[PDB]
C-alpha cells in the first residue's frame, strides 16, 4: 500500500523518479509530500545509529531495514531558536508540536487513543511496512489521521526499500546523514536539547 507507492520514488538505477514525485504532490494531503521532500533535501535529517562496535557503512544502512539497531532519527535545528525533533517510527511518534497538537483533542475519558488515530491491519498488504507498529499486530498508523512531515520523511527512508535510503544518504546528492555513534557521551549529547 503506502510502501509500494513510495518505493517507486527511486528507479532501479538509483535515479529520482520525476514522474512519481509529480504524482506524489497530488496524492497526499496537507502538502505533506512537498513538506516531506523539503526536509529530505534540507540536509537537516540525521539517522544516528548506536554503534559501540565499528560496522561497515553498508552494514549500517542495511541494518536499518533488516537488522535491529538502536537508532535515533533526528531533524537538526535550522535556527538559533530551535530544538531537535526526534522520531520513533516503530511507535509512530514525533516530538514535534504538530504531533502533540493532533493527539490532544482526542484525549477523552474512556477512549483508546489508537481508535482515533490508527487503522486496522487486515486490509493492508503483507509487504507494506509503512506505519507498521512494533508489538501491535492488529493496528497500524493511519497517515490520514496523524502524520507530520517528520514521520513522513523518515518513513519514506526507512519503510519503503533499502534503495530509497541509499539514494538520499549516499553518493554526491547526499542530503540525509546516517552516522554511527561509538561513545555514550556523544549519544547522550544528541538528546540534551530535545526536552
Amino acid at each position: 500500500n503506502y510502501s509500494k507507492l513510495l518505493r517507486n520514488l527511486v528507479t532501479e538505477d538509483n535515479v529520482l523518479n520525476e514522474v512519481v514525485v509529480s504524482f506524489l504532490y497530488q496524492l497526499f494531503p496537507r502538502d505533506l509530500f512537498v513538506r516531506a521532500f523539503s526536509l529530505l533535501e534540507s540536509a537537516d535529517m540525521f539517522i544516528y545509529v548506536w554503534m559501540p562496535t565499528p560496522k561497515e557503512a553498508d552494514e549500517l544502512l542495511e541494518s536499518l531495514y533488516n537488522g535491529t539497531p538502536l537508532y535515533r532519527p533526528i531533524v537538526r535545528p535550522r535556527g538559533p531558536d530551535d530544538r531537535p525533533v526526534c522520531v520513533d517510527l516503530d511507535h509512530w511518534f514525533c516530538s514535534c508540536t504538530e504531533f502533540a497538537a493532533t493527539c490532544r483533542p482526542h484525549l477523552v475519558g474512556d477512549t483508546p487513543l489508537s481508535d482515533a488515530l490508527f487503522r486496522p491491519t487486515e486490509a493492508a498488504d503483507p509487504d507494506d511496512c509503512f506505519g507498521m507498529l512494533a508489538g501491535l499486530q492488529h493496528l497500524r498508523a493511519d497517515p490520514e489521521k496523524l502524520m507530520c512531515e517528520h514521520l513522513f520523511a523518515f518513513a519514506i527512508l526507512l519503510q519503503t526499500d533499502l534503495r530509497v535510503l541509499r539514494h538520499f544518504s549516499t553518493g554526491p546528492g547526499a542530503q540525509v546523514f546516517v552516522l554511527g555513534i561509538t561513545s555514550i557521551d556523544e549519544w547522550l549529547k544528541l538528546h540534551l536539547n530535545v526536552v
Binding site: 538502536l70 516530538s95 487513543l113 508489538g135 549519544w187 547522550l188
Partner: protein, 130 residues
C-alpha cells in the same frame, strides 16, 4: 494508596527497582513519611528524559522495574492538558517504555495526589507497544 504501596516497596528494598521522585511536592512526601531499590529525586523533566535515554543505551539491564512518581507535578498538570504538555508527557512515556523494549523491565507510573485522566490515557497508548 498507590503512593503508600510505593513507600512499602522503598522500605523493604528487596526488589531491583529504580524510583524516580519528581518535583518538590513529591520529595517532601517521601521525606515526611519515610540495597536493591534506587531512589532518585529530579525536579526537571529534562533529567528524567536523559536518564531514561541512558538506561536505554546501557548494555546491561540493571533494574527489573522502573517507577515514575510525580509526573503530574513537573508537567504542571492543572485542568486539561495543552499541546506542550501532551508533547512532554508523550516524550517521557515513549522513552520510558523504550527501556522496557530494550531491557524488558516493568514500567510503572505512580501519581502524587489525584492522577490526571488524560495522562492516564496517554500512558495506556504507549503501553500497547510493549
Amino acid at each position: 494508596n498507590a503512593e503508600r504501596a510505593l513507600l512499602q516497596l522503598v522500605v523493604e528494598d528487596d526488589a531491583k527497582a529504580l524510583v524516580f521522585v519528581l518535583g518538590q511536592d513529591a520529595r517532601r512526601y517521601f521525606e515526611e513519611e519515610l540495597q536493591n531499590v534506587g531512589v532518585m529525586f529530579l525536579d526537571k523533566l529534562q533529567y528524567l528524559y536523559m536518564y531514561l535515554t541512558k538506561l536505554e543505551v546501557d548494555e546491561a539491564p540493571e533494574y527489573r522495574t522502573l517507577v515514575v512518581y510525580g509526573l503530574e507535578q513537573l508537567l504542571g498538570a492543572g485542568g486539561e492538558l495543552d499541546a506542550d504538555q501532551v508533547r512532554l508527557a508523550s516524550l517521557i512515556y515513549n522513552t520510558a517504555f523504550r527501556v522496557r523494549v530494550r531491557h524488558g523491565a516493568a514500567v510503572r507510573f505512580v501519581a502524587h495526589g489525584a492522577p490526571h485522566a488524560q495522562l492516564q490515557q496517554l500512558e495506556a497508548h504507549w503501553r500497547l507497544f510493549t
